[PDB]
Amino acid sequence: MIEKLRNIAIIAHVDHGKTTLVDKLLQQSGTILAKNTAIKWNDYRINIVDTPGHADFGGEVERVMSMVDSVLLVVDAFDGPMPQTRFVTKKAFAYGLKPIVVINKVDRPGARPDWVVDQVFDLFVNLDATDEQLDFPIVYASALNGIAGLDHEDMAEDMTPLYQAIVDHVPAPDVDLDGPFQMQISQLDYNSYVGVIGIGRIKRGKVKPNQQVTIIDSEGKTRNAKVGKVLGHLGLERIETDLAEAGDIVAITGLGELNISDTVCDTQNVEALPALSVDEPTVSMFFCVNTSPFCGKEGKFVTSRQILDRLNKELVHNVALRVEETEDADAFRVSGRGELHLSVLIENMRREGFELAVSRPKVIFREIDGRKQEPYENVTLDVEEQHQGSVMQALGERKGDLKNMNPDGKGRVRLDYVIPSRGLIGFRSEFMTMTSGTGLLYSTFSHYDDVRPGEVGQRQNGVLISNGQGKAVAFALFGLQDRGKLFLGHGAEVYEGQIIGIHSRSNDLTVNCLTVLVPPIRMTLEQALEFIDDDELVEVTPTSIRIRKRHLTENDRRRAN
Ligand SMILES: Nc1nc2c(ncn2[C@@H]2O[C@H](COP(=O)(O)OP(=O)(O)O)[C@@H](OP(=O)(O)OP(=O)(O)O)[C@H]2O)c(=O)[nH]1
Ligand SMILES: [Mg+2]
Protein backbone atom coordinates (compact mmCIF):
# COMPACT_ATOMS: atom_id res chain seq x y z
CA MET A 1 0.00 0.00 0.00
CA ILE A 2 1.13 3.53 -0.93
CA GLU A 3 3.64 1.92 -3.29
CA LYS A 4 1.79 2.73 -6.48
CA LEU A 5 4.51 5.34 -7.01
CA ARG A 6 6.66 5.62 -10.12
CA ASN A 7 9.47 8.18 -10.04
CA ILE A 8 10.97 8.46 -13.51
CA ALA A 9 13.27 10.93 -15.26
CA ILE A 10 12.79 11.80 -18.93
CA ILE A 11 15.51 12.32 -21.54
CA ALA A 12 15.11 13.71 -25.05
CA HIS A 13 17.21 15.68 -27.52
CA VAL A 14 15.60 19.02 -28.43
CA ASP A 15 12.56 18.80 -30.75
CA HIS A 16 12.14 15.05 -30.17
CA GLY A 17 8.76 15.21 -28.45
CA LYS A 18 9.40 15.23 -24.70
CA THR A 19 7.31 18.33 -23.98
CA THR A 20 4.56 17.00 -26.25
CA LEU A 21 4.67 13.40 -24.98
CA VAL A 22 4.29 14.32 -21.30
CA ASP A 23 1.59 16.77 -22.41
CA LYS A 24 -0.50 13.84 -23.65
CA LEU A 25 0.05 11.60 -20.62
CA LEU A 26 -1.28 14.49 -18.54
CA GLN A 27 -4.54 15.01 -20.43
CA GLN A 28 -5.16 11.28 -20.98
CA SER A 29 -5.07 10.69 -17.23
CA GLY A 30 -7.17 10.98 -14.09
CA THR A 31 -5.25 14.00 -12.82
CA ILE A 32 8.18 24.11 -21.62
CA LEU A 33 7.92 21.26 -19.11
CA ALA A 34 7.83 21.75 -15.37
CA LYS A 35 10.93 20.52 -13.52
CA ASN A 36 8.57 17.78 -12.36
CA THR A 37 5.20 16.62 -13.70
CA ALA A 38 2.89 14.58 -11.48
CA ILE A 39 0.43 12.22 -13.15
CA LYS A 40 -2.50 10.15 -11.86
CA TRP A 41 -3.20 6.95 -13.77
CA ASN A 42 -5.96 5.02 -12.03
CA ASP A 43 -4.39 4.55 -8.60
CA TYR A 44 -0.78 4.97 -9.72
CA ARG A 45 1.10 8.23 -9.17
CA ILE A 46 3.76 8.90 -11.81
CA ASN A 47 6.41 11.56 -11.22
CA ILE A 48 8.09 12.63 -14.45
CA VAL A 49 11.22 14.61 -13.59
CA ASP A 50 12.63 16.78 -16.36
CA THR A 51 16.35 16.73 -17.16
CA PRO A 52 18.17 19.94 -18.06
CA GLY A 53 19.77 21.08 -21.30
CA HIS A 54 22.93 19.36 -22.55
CA ALA A 55 25.46 21.46 -20.66
CA ASP A 56 26.56 20.72 -17.10
CA PHE A 57 23.92 22.79 -15.30
CA GLY A 58 25.99 22.41 -12.13
CA GLY A 59 25.53 18.67 -12.38
CA GLU A 60 21.77 18.71 -11.94
CA VAL A 61 21.71 15.50 -13.96
CA GLU A 62 23.03 13.57 -10.96
CA ARG A 63 20.60 15.42 -8.69
CA VAL A 64 17.64 14.45 -10.88
CA MET A 65 18.81 10.82 -11.10
CA SER A 66 19.14 10.82 -7.31
CA MET A 67 15.37 11.33 -7.11
CA VAL A 68 14.25 8.73 -9.65
CA ASP A 69 14.19 4.94 -9.95
CA SER A 70 14.14 4.77 -13.75
CA VAL A 71 14.76 6.86 -16.86
CA LEU A 72 12.63 7.52 -19.95
CA LEU A 73 14.60 8.01 -23.16
CA VAL A 74 12.57 9.59 -25.97
CA VAL A 75 13.95 9.07 -29.48
CA ASP A 76 12.91 10.38 -32.90
CA ALA A 77 11.87 7.51 -35.17
CA PHE A 78 13.93 8.85 -38.07
CA ASP A 79 16.99 10.77 -36.82
CA GLY A 80 17.46 8.22 -34.06
CA PRO A 81 19.32 9.02 -30.86
CA MET A 82 21.56 12.10 -31.01
CA PRO A 83 25.05 12.24 -29.42
CA GLN A 84 24.09 15.29 -27.33
CA THR A 85 22.12 13.12 -24.89
CA ARG A 86 25.21 10.94 -24.35
CA PHE A 87 26.16 12.16 -20.91
CA VAL A 88 22.68 12.40 -19.41
CA THR A 89 22.07 8.77 -20.37
CA LYS A 90 25.54 7.88 -19.10
CA LYS A 91 24.86 9.26 -15.63
CA ALA A 92 21.48 7.52 -15.46
CA PHE A 93 23.43 4.31 -16.04
CA ALA A 94 25.96 5.28 -13.38
CA TYR A 95 23.10 5.53 -10.89
CA GLY A 96 22.15 1.98 -11.86
CA LEU A 97 18.89 3.02 -13.51
CA LYS A 98 17.35 0.79 -16.17
CA PRO A 99 15.82 2.74 -19.08
CA ILE A 100 12.45 2.82 -20.82
CA VAL A 101 12.91 3.73 -24.48
CA VAL A 102 10.18 5.66 -26.27
CA ILE A 103 10.53 5.89 -30.03
CA ASN A 104 8.50 8.97 -30.95
CA LYS A 105 7.38 10.57 -34.23
CA VAL A 106 6.80 7.15 -35.76
CA ASP A 107 4.00 8.38 -38.01
CA ARG A 108 6.42 10.47 -40.08
CA PRO A 109 7.25 9.23 -43.59
CA GLY A 110 10.68 7.63 -43.82
CA ALA A 111 10.46 6.58 -40.18
CA ARG A 112 12.84 3.69 -39.55
CA PRO A 113 11.95 2.22 -36.11
CA ASP A 114 13.90 -0.99 -36.74
CA TRP A 115 17.02 1.07 -37.44
CA VAL A 116 16.69 3.42 -34.47
CA VAL A 117 16.23 0.40 -32.20
CA ASP A 118 19.66 -0.88 -33.26
CA GLN A 119 21.14 2.62 -32.93
CA VAL A 120 19.85 3.04 -29.38
CA PHE A 121 20.96 -0.50 -28.52
CA ASP A 122 24.43 0.21 -29.89
CA LEU A 123 24.57 3.59 -28.13
CA PHE A 124 24.31 1.58 -24.92
CA VAL A 125 27.96 0.96 -25.43
CA ASN A 126 28.17 3.07 -22.32
CA LEU A 127 29.98 0.19 -20.78
CA ASP A 128 26.63 -0.35 -19.10
CA ALA A 129 25.38 -3.50 -17.41
CA THR A 130 24.00 -6.43 -19.36
CA ASP A 131 21.02 -5.89 -17.04
CA GLU A 132 20.37 -2.38 -18.38
CA GLN A 133 20.79 -3.03 -22.10
CA LEU A 134 18.94 -6.29 -21.51
CA ASP A 135 15.20 -5.95 -21.46
CA PHE A 136 14.82 -2.22 -21.80
CA PRO A 137 11.25 -2.23 -23.10
CA ILE A 138 10.38 -0.31 -26.26
CA VAL A 139 7.27 1.83 -26.62
CA TYR A 140 6.48 3.42 -29.97
CA ALA A 141 4.68 6.74 -29.78
CA SER A 142 3.18 9.52 -31.88
CA ALA A 143 2.35 12.20 -29.32
CA LEU A 144 1.14 14.47 -32.13
CA ASN A 145 -1.75 12.01 -32.33
CA GLY A 146 -1.38 10.41 -28.90
CA ILE A 147 -0.71 6.83 -29.98
CA ALA A 148 1.39 4.35 -27.97
CA GLY A 149 2.15 0.69 -28.69
CA LEU A 150 4.63 -2.16 -28.30
CA ASP A 151 4.61 -2.50 -32.08
CA HIS A 152 4.43 0.46 -34.49
CA GLU A 153 2.22 -1.11 -37.15
CA ASP A 154 -0.03 -2.53 -34.46
CA MET A 155 -0.80 0.38 -32.14
CA ALA A 156 -3.26 1.24 -29.36
CA GLU A 157 -5.82 4.04 -29.69
CA ASP A 158 -4.13 6.04 -26.92
CA MET A 159 -1.18 6.21 -24.50
CA THR A 160 -2.14 3.24 -22.29
CA PRO A 161 0.78 1.01 -23.40
CA LEU A 162 3.21 3.70 -22.20
CA TYR A 163 1.55 4.01 -18.79
CA GLN A 164 1.54 0.23 -18.48
CA ALA A 165 5.21 0.04 -19.43
CA ILE A 166 6.05 2.69 -16.83
CA VAL A 167 4.08 0.83 -14.16
CA ASP A 168 5.53 -2.55 -15.14
CA HIS A 169 9.22 -1.72 -15.57
CA VAL A 170 9.86 1.17 -13.17
CA PRO A 171 10.61 -0.04 -9.63
CA ALA A 172 8.81 1.52 -6.68
CA PRO A 173 11.03 3.85 -4.60
CA ASP A 174 13.48 2.11 -2.25
CA VAL A 175 12.16 3.87 0.85
CA ASP A 176 11.03 3.19 4.41
CA LEU A 177 7.66 4.72 5.26
CA ASP A 178 7.80 3.97 8.99
CA GLY A 179 11.25 5.36 9.82
CA PRO A 180 12.02 8.89 11.05
CA PHE A 181 11.77 11.76 8.55
CA GLN A 182 14.73 12.12 6.19
CA MET A 183 15.03 14.05 2.93
CA GLN A 184 17.95 15.37 0.89
CA ILE A 185 17.54 18.60 -1.09
CA SER A 186 18.12 17.80 -4.76
CA GLN A 187 17.02 21.07 -6.38
CA LEU A 188 16.14 24.58 -5.22
CA ASP A 189 13.50 27.15 -6.12
CA TYR A 190 12.34 30.61 -5.07
CA ASN A 191 9.17 32.66 -4.88
CA SER A 192 9.11 36.15 -3.34
CA TYR A 193 6.11 35.14 -1.22
CA VAL A 194 7.26 31.89 0.33
CA GLY A 195 11.03 32.35 0.30
CA VAL A 196 13.59 29.68 -0.55
CA ILE A 197 12.05 26.40 -1.71
CA GLY A 198 13.71 23.02 -1.12
CA ILE A 199 12.97 20.09 -3.41
CA GLY A 200 13.73 16.39 -2.98
CA ARG A 201 12.43 12.84 -2.71
CA ILE A 202 11.48 11.90 0.85
CA LYS A 203 13.73 8.96 1.70
CA ARG A 204 12.18 8.10 5.05
CA GLY A 205 9.36 9.12 7.37
CA LYS A 206 6.65 11.70 6.76
CA VAL A 207 6.38 15.49 6.98
CA LYS A 208 3.63 17.93 7.98
CA PRO A 209 3.39 21.73 8.01
CA ASN A 210 4.80 23.36 11.19
CA GLN A 211 6.74 20.18 11.97
CA GLN A 212 9.95 20.77 13.91
CA VAL A 213 12.99 19.72 11.92
CA THR A 214 16.80 19.61 11.87
CA ILE A 215 18.90 20.27 8.78
CA ILE A 216 22.40 18.81 8.43
CA ASP A 217 24.76 19.87 5.63
CA SER A 218 27.46 17.79 4.02
CA GLU A 219 30.21 18.29 6.57
CA GLY A 220 27.90 17.79 9.51
CA LYS A 221 26.88 21.20 10.79
CA THR A 222 23.29 21.27 12.01
CA ARG A 223 20.55 23.82 12.55
CA ASN A 224 16.96 23.64 13.73
CA ALA A 225 14.04 24.98 11.72
CA LYS A 226 10.27 24.72 11.43
CA VAL A 227 8.84 23.68 8.07
CA GLY A 228 6.30 26.23 6.89
CA LYS A 229 4.49 24.64 3.97
CA VAL A 230 4.72 21.21 2.39
CA LEU A 231 4.10 21.50 -1.35
CA GLY A 232 3.26 18.40 -3.37
CA HIS A 233 3.24 18.29 -7.17
CA LEU A 234 -0.04 17.69 -9.01
CA GLY A 235 -0.07 18.86 -12.62
CA LEU A 236 2.51 21.41 -13.61
CA GLU A 237 1.68 22.87 -10.23
CA ARG A 238 2.34 22.67 -6.50
CA ILE A 239 -0.50 22.55 -4.00
CA GLU A 240 -0.10 22.86 -0.25
CA THR A 241 -0.40 19.51 1.49
CA ASP A 242 -1.04 18.53 5.10
CA LEU A 243 1.06 15.40 4.63
CA ALA A 244 3.87 14.11 2.43
CA GLU A 245 5.49 10.72 3.03
CA ALA A 246 8.38 8.56 1.79
CA GLY A 247 8.66 8.21 -1.98
CA ASP A 248 6.96 11.55 -2.58
CA ILE A 249 8.73 14.24 -4.57
CA VAL A 250 7.78 17.47 -2.82
CA ALA A 251 8.89 21.03 -2.14
CA ILE A 252 9.47 22.37 1.38
CA THR A 253 9.12 25.98 2.44
CA GLY A 254 9.81 27.22 5.97
CA LEU A 255 13.50 26.39 6.08
CA GLY A 256 16.18 29.04 5.56
CA GLU A 257 19.04 29.02 3.08
CA LEU A 258 18.71 25.41 1.97
CA ASN A 259 21.72 24.10 0.07
CA ILE A 260 21.76 21.21 -2.38
CA SER A 261 22.84 18.03 -0.51
CA ASP A 262 21.40 19.36 2.75
CA THR A 263 19.54 16.62 4.61
CA VAL A 264 16.28 17.48 6.37
CA CYS A 265 15.66 15.19 9.34
CA ASP A 266 13.36 14.55 12.28
CA THR A 267 14.93 16.60 15.10
CA GLN A 268 15.89 13.49 17.06
CA ASN A 269 17.10 11.19 14.28
CA VAL A 270 19.49 13.39 12.33
CA GLU A 271 21.12 11.30 9.62
CA ALA A 272 22.73 12.93 6.60
CA LEU A 273 22.18 11.31 3.22
CA PRO A 274 25.52 10.93 1.40
CA ALA A 275 26.57 13.84 -0.81
CA LEU A 276 26.37 12.36 -4.25
CA SER A 277 28.25 13.44 -7.36
CA VAL A 278 31.62 14.39 -8.61
CA ASP A 279 32.95 14.19 -12.13
CA GLU A 280 36.65 13.85 -11.37
CA PRO A 281 38.60 16.03 -13.81
CA THR A 282 40.75 14.26 -16.41
CA VAL A 283 42.44 17.07 -18.34
CA SER A 284 44.58 19.75 -16.69
CA MET A 285 45.63 23.09 -18.16
CA PHE A 286 47.48 26.20 -16.94
CA PHE A 287 45.91 29.67 -16.94
CA CYS A 288 48.52 32.42 -16.60
CA VAL A 289 48.79 36.19 -16.45
CA ASN A 290 49.69 37.45 -19.91
CA THR A 291 53.39 38.13 -19.41
CA SER A 292 53.69 39.41 -22.99
CA PRO A 293 54.93 42.94 -23.81
CA PHE A 294 51.28 43.29 -24.83
CA CYS A 295 49.93 43.24 -21.27
CA GLY A 296 46.98 45.62 -21.19
CA LYS A 297 46.52 46.18 -24.92
CA GLU A 298 43.27 44.52 -25.99
CA GLY A 299 41.97 43.21 -22.67
CA LYS A 300 40.55 45.09 -19.70
CA PHE A 301 41.05 42.76 -16.71
CA VAL A 302 44.51 41.17 -16.74
CA THR A 303 45.87 40.71 -13.17
CA SER A 304 46.90 37.76 -10.93
CA ARG A 305 43.97 37.84 -8.50
CA GLN A 306 41.78 39.19 -11.32
CA ILE A 307 42.06 35.71 -12.80
CA LEU A 308 41.99 33.78 -9.51
CA ASP A 309 38.82 35.70 -8.60
CA ARG A 310 36.86 34.37 -11.58
CA LEU A 311 38.74 31.12 -10.89
CA ASN A 312 36.47 30.79 -7.85
CA LYS A 313 33.24 31.92 -9.49
CA GLU A 314 33.05 29.25 -12.18
CA LEU A 315 33.80 26.67 -9.47
CA VAL A 316 30.09 26.68 -8.64
CA HIS A 317 28.93 26.55 -12.27
CA ASN A 318 30.85 23.33 -12.39
CA VAL A 319 31.92 20.50 -10.06
CA ALA A 320 33.76 18.78 -12.91
CA LEU A 321 36.52 21.39 -12.65
CA ARG A 322 39.07 22.19 -9.98
CA VAL A 323 41.41 25.11 -9.39
CA GLU A 324 44.83 24.91 -7.73
CA GLU A 325 47.50 27.33 -6.55
CA THR A 326 50.82 27.07 -8.37
CA GLU A 327 54.08 28.32 -6.88
CA ASP A 328 54.35 30.85 -9.66
CA ALA A 329 51.82 33.27 -8.16
CA ASP A 330 50.73 34.34 -11.65
CA ALA A 331 49.68 30.97 -13.08
CA PHE A 332 47.06 28.42 -12.04
CA ARG A 333 46.40 24.70 -12.48
CA VAL A 334 42.78 24.37 -13.58
CA SER A 335 41.44 20.95 -14.54
CA GLY A 336 38.28 19.80 -16.33
CA ARG A 337 36.45 16.97 -18.07
CA GLY A 338 37.56 17.27 -21.69
CA GLU A 339 39.64 19.79 -23.60
CA LEU A 340 36.31 21.04 -24.93
CA HIS A 341 35.25 21.72 -21.33
CA LEU A 342 38.12 24.09 -20.58
CA SER A 343 38.29 25.53 -24.10
CA VAL A 344 34.98 27.40 -24.31
CA LEU A 345 35.57 28.63 -20.76
CA ILE A 346 38.33 30.79 -22.20
CA GLU A 347 36.30 31.75 -25.29
CA ASN A 348 33.85 33.15 -22.75
CA MET A 349 36.42 34.70 -20.42
CA ARG A 350 37.70 36.14 -23.68
CA ARG A 351 34.67 38.33 -24.36
CA GLU A 352 34.04 38.44 -20.63
CA GLY A 353 36.87 40.91 -21.24
CA PHE A 354 40.06 39.15 -20.19
CA GLU A 355 43.64 38.48 -21.21
CA LEU A 356 45.63 35.44 -20.14
CA ALA A 357 48.29 32.96 -21.24
CA VAL A 358 47.42 29.26 -21.36
CA SER A 359 49.52 26.10 -21.72
CA ARG A 360 48.68 22.98 -23.71
CA PRO A 361 46.26 20.52 -22.08
CA LYS A 362 47.60 17.35 -20.49
CA VAL A 363 45.86 14.32 -19.02
CA ILE A 364 45.80 14.00 -15.25
CA PHE A 365 47.67 10.85 -14.30
CA ARG A 366 46.72 8.82 -11.24
CA GLU A 367 48.44 6.03 -9.34
CA ILE A 368 46.22 3.14 -8.29
CA ASP A 369 47.81 0.15 -6.51
CA GLY A 370 51.36 1.27 -7.29
CA ARG A 371 50.56 1.21 -11.00
CA LYS A 372 50.14 4.61 -12.64
CA GLN A 373 47.02 4.90 -14.81
CA GLU A 374 45.62 7.37 -17.35
CA PRO A 375 42.13 8.16 -18.68
CA TYR A 376 40.87 6.12 -21.63
CA GLU A 377 37.68 7.12 -23.44
CA ASN A 378 35.19 5.93 -26.06
CA VAL A 379 35.37 7.57 -29.49
CA THR A 380 32.90 7.11 -32.33
CA LEU A 381 33.64 8.67 -35.71
CA ASP A 382 31.42 9.21 -38.75
CA VAL A 383 33.45 9.77 -41.92
CA GLU A 384 33.17 9.16 -45.64
CA GLU A 385 34.76 6.02 -47.07
CA GLN A 386 37.52 7.95 -48.82
CA HIS A 387 38.92 9.03 -45.45
CA GLN A 388 38.24 5.63 -43.88
CA GLY A 389 41.75 4.21 -44.22
CA SER A 390 43.25 7.62 -43.45
CA VAL A 391 41.65 8.36 -40.07
CA MET A 392 42.08 4.68 -39.21
CA GLN A 393 45.79 4.99 -39.86
CA ALA A 394 45.99 8.19 -37.80
CA LEU A 395 44.13 6.94 -34.71
CA GLY A 396 46.32 3.85 -34.45
CA GLU A 397 49.35 6.12 -34.15
CA ARG A 398 47.67 7.83 -31.22
CA LYS A 399 47.29 4.45 -29.51
CA GLY A 400 43.69 3.95 -30.59
CA ASP A 401 42.33 0.41 -30.38
CA LEU A 402 39.65 -0.36 -32.96
CA LYS A 403 36.54 -2.00 -31.50
CA ASN A 404 33.92 -1.72 -34.24
CA MET A 405 33.11 -0.34 -37.67
CA ASN A 406 29.80 -0.09 -39.52
CA PRO A 407 29.44 1.09 -43.15
CA ASP A 408 26.44 3.33 -43.83
CA GLY A 409 25.42 1.61 -47.04
CA LYS A 410 25.17 5.12 -48.45
CA GLY A 411 28.88 5.89 -48.71
CA ARG A 412 29.67 6.79 -45.10
CA VAL A 413 30.90 4.69 -42.18
CA ARG A 414 31.07 4.83 -38.39
CA LEU A 415 34.16 3.66 -36.49
CA ASP A 416 34.44 2.92 -32.77
CA TYR A 417 37.60 3.28 -30.68
CA VAL A 418 39.02 2.85 -27.20
CA ILE A 419 41.73 5.48 -26.87
CA PRO A 420 43.72 7.12 -24.09
CA SER A 421 42.78 10.80 -23.74
CA ARG A 422 46.50 11.42 -24.21
CA GLY A 423 46.32 10.25 -27.82
CA LEU A 424 43.01 11.97 -28.57
CA ILE A 425 44.03 15.47 -27.44
CA GLY A 426 43.93 18.01 -30.26
CA PHE A 427 42.77 15.54 -32.90
CA ARG A 428 39.70 17.49 -34.04
CA SER A 429 41.87 19.95 -35.96
CA GLU A 430 43.69 17.13 -37.73
CA PHE A 431 40.34 15.36 -38.13
CA MET A 432 38.27 18.00 -39.93
CA THR A 433 40.77 19.11 -42.59
CA MET A 434 41.67 15.45 -43.13
CA THR A 435 38.02 14.56 -43.65
CA SER A 436 37.54 17.94 -45.36
CA GLY A 437 35.01 19.09 -42.76
CA THR A 438 32.40 16.41 -43.43
CA GLY A 439 33.37 13.92 -40.73
CA LEU A 440 31.90 13.79 -37.24
CA LEU A 441 33.60 12.78 -33.99
CA TYR A 442 32.21 12.14 -30.51
CA SER A 443 33.86 11.13 -27.24
CA THR A 444 32.88 9.80 -23.81
CA PHE A 445 35.11 9.08 -20.82
CA SER A 446 35.16 5.38 -19.97
CA HIS A 447 37.72 4.40 -17.34
CA TYR A 448 41.22 4.81 -15.99
CA ASP A 449 43.59 1.94 -16.78
CA ASP A 450 47.32 1.13 -16.89
CA VAL A 451 49.06 3.60 -19.18
CA ARG A 452 49.97 2.59 -22.72
CA PRO A 453 53.78 2.65 -22.82
CA GLY A 454 55.43 5.31 -24.97
CA GLU A 455 54.53 8.80 -26.12
CA VAL A 456 52.30 10.38 -28.76
CA GLY A 457 53.99 11.92 -31.81
CA GLN A 458 55.17 15.48 -31.20
CA ARG A 459 54.68 18.42 -33.58
CA GLN A 460 57.43 17.40 -36.07
CA ASN A 461 57.63 20.90 -37.59
CA GLY A 462 59.37 23.77 -35.86
CA VAL A 463 58.09 27.33 -35.61
CA LEU A 464 59.16 30.68 -37.03
CA ILE A 465 59.82 32.93 -34.05
CA SER A 466 59.97 36.73 -34.29
CA ASN A 467 63.25 38.34 -33.22
CA GLY A 468 61.83 41.80 -32.56
CA GLN A 469 58.86 44.07 -32.00
CA GLY A 470 57.16 46.11 -34.72
CA LYS A 471 54.94 46.03 -37.80
CA ALA A 472 55.49 43.12 -40.18
CA VAL A 473 56.43 44.27 -43.68
CA ALA A 474 55.42 42.47 -46.88
CA PHE A 475 58.99 42.76 -48.17
CA ALA A 476 60.19 40.39 -45.44
CA LEU A 477 57.19 38.04 -45.41
CA PHE A 478 57.62 37.19 -49.11
CA GLY A 479 61.07 35.86 -48.21
CA LEU A 480 59.70 33.70 -45.39
CA GLN A 481 57.43 31.83 -47.80
CA ASP A 482 60.63 30.25 -49.11
CA ARG A 483 60.61 28.20 -45.91
CA GLY A 484 57.10 27.75 -44.51
CA LYS A 485 53.57 29.10 -44.06
CA LEU A 486 52.73 32.35 -42.27
CA PHE A 487 50.18 33.60 -39.73
CA LEU A 488 49.95 37.20 -40.94
CA GLY A 489 50.22 39.68 -43.81
CA HIS A 490 51.46 43.25 -44.24
CA GLY A 491 50.94 45.67 -41.36
CA ALA A 492 50.40 43.28 -38.45
CA GLU A 493 51.87 44.26 -35.07
CA VAL A 494 54.32 41.75 -33.57
CA TYR A 495 56.75 41.44 -30.62
CA GLU A 496 59.79 39.28 -29.77
CA GLY A 497 59.15 35.68 -28.76
CA GLN A 498 55.94 35.53 -30.74
CA ILE A 499 55.42 32.67 -33.19
CA ILE A 500 54.59 33.91 -36.69
CA GLY A 501 54.77 30.83 -38.90
CA ILE A 502 55.31 27.12 -39.44
CA HIS A 503 58.89 26.15 -40.30
CA SER A 504 59.18 23.81 -43.29
CA ARG A 505 61.76 21.86 -41.29
CA SER A 506 61.84 20.44 -37.77
CA ASN A 507 63.92 22.95 -35.79
CA ASP A 508 62.75 26.28 -34.39
CA LEU A 509 63.94 29.27 -36.41
CA THR A 510 64.22 32.79 -35.04
CA VAL A 511 63.36 35.07 -37.95
CA ASN A 512 63.03 38.78 -38.81
CA CYS A 513 59.82 40.09 -40.40
CA LEU A 514 60.62 43.76 -39.80
CA THR A 515 63.24 44.68 -42.42
CA VAL A 516 52.47 40.04 -52.98
CA LEU A 517 51.72 37.52 -50.22
CA VAL A 518 49.99 34.15 -50.14
CA PRO A 519 46.91 34.05 -47.86
CA PRO A 520 47.74 33.92 -44.12
CA ILE A 521 46.61 31.15 -41.78
CA ARG A 522 44.20 32.34 -39.12
CA MET A 523 43.83 29.79 -36.33
CA THR A 524 40.73 29.33 -34.20
CA LEU A 525 41.39 29.02 -30.45
CA GLU A 526 41.00 25.24 -30.49
CA GLN A 527 43.02 24.90 -33.70
CA ALA A 528 45.91 26.96 -32.31
CA LEU A 529 45.69 25.27 -28.91
CA GLU A 530 46.27 21.88 -30.54
CA PHE A 531 49.31 23.35 -32.29
CA ILE A 532 51.12 24.57 -29.16
CA ASP A 533 54.07 22.60 -27.78
CA ASP A 534 55.06 22.17 -24.12
CA ASP A 535 57.54 25.06 -24.20
CA GLU A 536 54.94 27.42 -25.66
CA LEU A 537 51.74 29.27 -24.72
CA VAL A 538 48.57 30.80 -26.15
CA GLU A 539 47.91 34.46 -25.41
CA VAL A 540 44.16 35.14 -25.46
CA THR A 541 42.66 38.61 -25.98
CA PRO A 542 38.99 39.73 -26.42
CA THR A 543 39.00 39.93 -30.29
CA SER A 544 42.04 37.71 -31.07
CA ILE A 545 44.63 35.35 -29.64
CA ARG A 546 48.37 34.98 -30.27
CA ILE A 547 50.85 32.10 -30.18
CA ARG A 548 54.01 32.63 -28.13
CA LYS A 549 57.11 30.85 -26.79
CA ARG A 550 57.49 30.51 -23.02
CA HIS A 551 60.92 32.15 -23.02
CA LEU A 552 60.59 35.23 -25.21
CA THR A 553 64.25 35.73 -26.10
CA GLU A 554 66.68 33.74 -28.28
CA ASN A 555 69.18 33.41 -25.43
CA ASP A 556 66.77 32.09 -22.78
CA ARG A 557 65.52 29.31 -25.06
CA ARG A 558 69.05 28.15 -25.90
CA ARG A 559 69.82 27.89 -22.18
CA ALA A 560 66.85 25.56 -21.71
CA ASN A 561 68.34 22.88 -23.97
N1 LIG B 1 5.06 14.04 -36.99
C1 LIG B 1 5.17 14.22 -35.55
N2 LIG B 1 5.68 15.47 -35.00
C2 LIG B 1 5.80 15.66 -33.53
C3 LIG B 1 5.42 14.65 -32.68
N3 LIG B 1 5.62 15.06 -31.43
C4 LIG B 1 6.12 16.32 -31.48
N4 LIG B 1 6.22 16.67 -32.78
C5 LIG B 1 6.65 17.78 -33.36
O1 LIG B 1 7.74 18.40 -32.52
C6 LIG B 1 7.31 19.57 -32.12
C7 LIG B 1 7.27 19.62 -30.64
O2 LIG B 1 8.54 19.93 -30.13
P1 LIG B 1 9.10 19.04 -28.87
O3 LIG B 1 9.83 17.85 -29.42
O4 LIG B 1 7.94 18.59 -28.01
O5 LIG B 1 10.16 19.93 -27.96
P2 LIG B 1 11.23 19.25 -26.90
O6 LIG B 1 12.14 18.30 -27.64
O7 LIG B 1 12.05 20.33 -26.25
O8 LIG B 1 10.46 18.49 -25.85
C8 LIG B 1 5.77 19.81 -32.72
O9 LIG B 1 5.71 21.10 -33.44
P3 LIG B 1 5.97 22.53 -32.65
O10 LIG B 1 5.24 22.54 -31.33
O11 LIG B 1 5.48 23.67 -33.51
O12 LIG B 1 7.59 22.73 -32.38
P4 LIG B 1 8.22 24.08 -31.69
O13 LIG B 1 7.75 25.30 -32.45
O14 LIG B 1 7.77 24.18 -30.25
O15 LIG B 1 9.73 24.01 -31.74
C9 LIG B 1 5.51 18.90 -33.51
O16 LIG B 1 5.55 19.45 -34.91
C10 LIG B 1 4.88 13.33 -33.25
O17 LIG B 1 4.56 12.46 -32.51
N5 LIG B 1 4.77 13.15 -34.66
MG1 LIG C 1 11.05 23.61 -28.14
Residue numbers in the entry: 1 to 31, 56 to 539, 556 to 601
Give verbatim excerpts from the published study on this entry.
BipA (TypA or YihK) is a member of the translational GTPase protein family, to which translational factors EF-G,2 EF-Tu, and IF2 also belong. The translational GTPase BipA regulates the expression of virulence and pathogenicity factors in several eubacteria. Full-length BipA can be subdivided into five domains. Beginning from the N terminus, the first four domains are homologous to domains I, II, III, and V of EF-G, whereas the last domain at the C terminus is distinct and protein-specific.
To gain a better understanding of the effect of ppGpp on BipA, we solved the structure of full-length BipA in the presence of GDP to a resolution of 3.1 Å and in the presence of ppGpp to a resolution of 3.3 Å. In each of these structures, the nucleotide and the coordinated magnesium ion can be localized unambiguously in the initial unbiased difference electron maps. Surprisingly, the structure of BipA with bound ppGpp is very similar to that of BipA with bound GDP, reflected in a low r.m.s.d. of 0.28 Å across all matching main chain atoms. Even the GDP portion of ppGpp is in the same structural environment as GDP by itself, forming the same interactions. The additional 3′-pyrophosphate of ppGpp extends toward the 5′-pyrophosphate group chelating a magnesium ion between them. The crystal structure and small-angle x-ray scattering data of the protein with bound nucleotides, together with a thermodynamic analysis of the binding of GDP and of ppGpp to BipA, indicate that the ppGpp-bound form of BipA adopts the structure of the GDP form. The small numerical value of ΔCp for GDP binding was interpreted as reflecting the absence of a conformational change of EF-G upon GDP binding. We, therefore, similarly conclude that the presence of the 3′-pyrophosphate of ppGpp does not induce a conformation in BipA different from that seen in the presence of GDP, a conclusion consistent with the above x-ray crystal structures. GDP-bound BipA has similar values of 32.02 and 32.68 Å for Guinier and real-space Rg values, respectively, and a Dmax of 107 Å, as does ppGpp-bound BipA with a Guinier Rg of 32.21 Å and real-space Rg of 32.94 Å and a Dmax of 111 Å. In the case of BipA, it is not simply the GTPase domain by itself, but the whole protein that adopts the same conformation upon binding of GDP or ppGpp. Our results show that the binding of ppGpp to BipA does not induce a nucleotide-specific conformational change, suggesting that both the ppGpp nucleotide and the small ribosomal subunit must be present to switch the binding specificity of BipA.
